[PDB]
Amino acid sequence: RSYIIPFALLCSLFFLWAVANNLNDILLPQFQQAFFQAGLIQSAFYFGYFIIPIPAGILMKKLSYKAGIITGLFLYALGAALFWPAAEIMNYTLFLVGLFIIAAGLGCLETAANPFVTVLGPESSGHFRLNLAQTFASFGAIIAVVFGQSLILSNVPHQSQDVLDKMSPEQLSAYKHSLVLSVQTPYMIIVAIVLLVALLIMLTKFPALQSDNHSDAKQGSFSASLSRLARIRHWRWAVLAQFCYVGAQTACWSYLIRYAVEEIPGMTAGFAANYLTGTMVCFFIGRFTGTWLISRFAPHKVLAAYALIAMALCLISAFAGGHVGLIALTLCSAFMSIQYPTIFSLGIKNLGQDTKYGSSFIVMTIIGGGIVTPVMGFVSDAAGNIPTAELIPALCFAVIFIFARFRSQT
Ligand SMILES: CCCCCCCCCO[C@@H]1O[C@H](CO)[C@@H](O)[C@H](O)[C@H]1O
């Protein structure tokens, strides 16, 4: 009935957001590629994806999911717009703040949008719901890159540091400014889009949800919800699973190009980037089919299946070499696909009141994407080769598979 149109609205809204945000992701390098400095950027990620979750979750429970969605969408656009002035007058701090603000908007929507979808109807199809909505997101990112990337990088000044270095100061001065005069258009478009969404949300009326309910005296408490969460094993485990996923995922993609160039003579860093784009096509295709699988079958089985397959690809990747290992690596994304969503739904469904704080944590495990890199680099260096470092992902996939035969409750 009324649980359905909002859903579809949301998928389309997942799509658009993934486009809009993905565009932000394409522009930032340039805006930053203008010039302790960049360590501060990477932390904006830890900030948005580690801090905000819980507070964002506090917001959710004392208000609603939609609040979080709305406020989250607000944070992002605020941070984004901060660029126009930060750009034009070349204040990095103004840039940095807008960044951090955007960062919180993401952690916000993340802890917010995901449970909202899985809960946006019957518990059983909560998993499929989120997956479909992700596929829409993923498709959005496809679009984002495909169309927008090329058809928006023809306004960006190509410049060999060769020239850039030789420029006089006033020239260099001038150059930089033309760059920001480029971002200040699709950036308005981006912001525009963010607002269009926020609007649509504010307008569309959603049905009532149990996990929303503020109905709770003292037991509604954070620490209350917290200790309650502790007793839950599959939630506990899903958290462990999601730390491992992000870990493994970023490990694959992160060192994929390095792998290519080190493994195949004579691979160019430029060319390997194709195997990378391929991986994204795998990912999306992976998700599409994967979700259709979640229609017919138990999520954990589809999860466990995909978990195992992915781990297998990695061992082939780690142990083989040449293209065989590379192709396995890129083919792996086809199976990471379904994982983030499913780990998430399986993780919460069925949490009730504790759904919201349940997410806040799940999301924080995105800290894993950063934590693997040193491990990846570490193992890699000890190994002498990238491939054997690919064992780390495989190791995550193994763990995630256990969770899939250990995901249950009652
Ligand atoms: C109308 C409300 C929309 C709220 C959206 C929050 C959903 C979070 C989904 O993350 C996005 O989805 C894709 C796959 O995860 C990524 O490719 C994209 O870069 C990422 O940002």
Swiss-Prot record:
GO MF terms, alphabetically ordered: arabinose:proton symporter activity; fucose:proton symporter activity; galactose:proton symporter activity; hexose:proton symporter activity
Gene3D superfamilies: MFS general substrate transporter like domains
Residues the UniProt record annotates as site (Important for activity): 25, 110
Membrane topology (Periplasmic): 89-92, 154-168, 263-268, 319-322, 383-385
Entry similarity comment: Belongs to the major facilitator superfamily. FHS transporter (TC 2.A.1.7) family.
Name of this protein: L-fucose-proton symporter
Cellular component terms (Gene Ontology): membrane; plasma membrane
PROSITE patterns: MFS (PS50850)
Primary site of residence: membrane
Function: Mediates the uptake of L-fucose across the boundary membrane with the concomitant transport of protons into the cell (symport system). Can also transport L-galactose and D-arabinose, but at reduced rates compared with L-fucose. Is not able to transport L-rhamnose and L-arabinose. Binds D-arabinose with the highest affinity, followed by L-fucose, and then by L-galactose.
Keywords: Carbohydrate metabolism, Cell inner membrane, Cell membrane, Fucose metabolism, Membrane, Sugar transport, Symport, Transmembrane, Transmembrane helix, Transport
Effect of residue 17 to F/I/Y: Strong decrease in L-fucose transport
Subcellular location: Cell inner membrane
Record InterPro entries: Lfuc_symporter_FucP (IPR005275), MFS (IPR011701), MFS_dom (IPR020846), MFS_trans_sf (IPR036259), MFS_TsgA-like (IPR050375)
GO terms classed as biological process: arabinose transmembrane transport; fructose transmembrane transport; fucose metabolic process; fucose transmembrane transport; galactose transmembrane transport
Transmembrane spans: 6-32, 37-62, 66-88, 93-119, 126-153, 169-202, 233-262, 269-294, 300-318, 323-347, 355-382, 386-405
Keyword Cell membrane (UniProt): yes
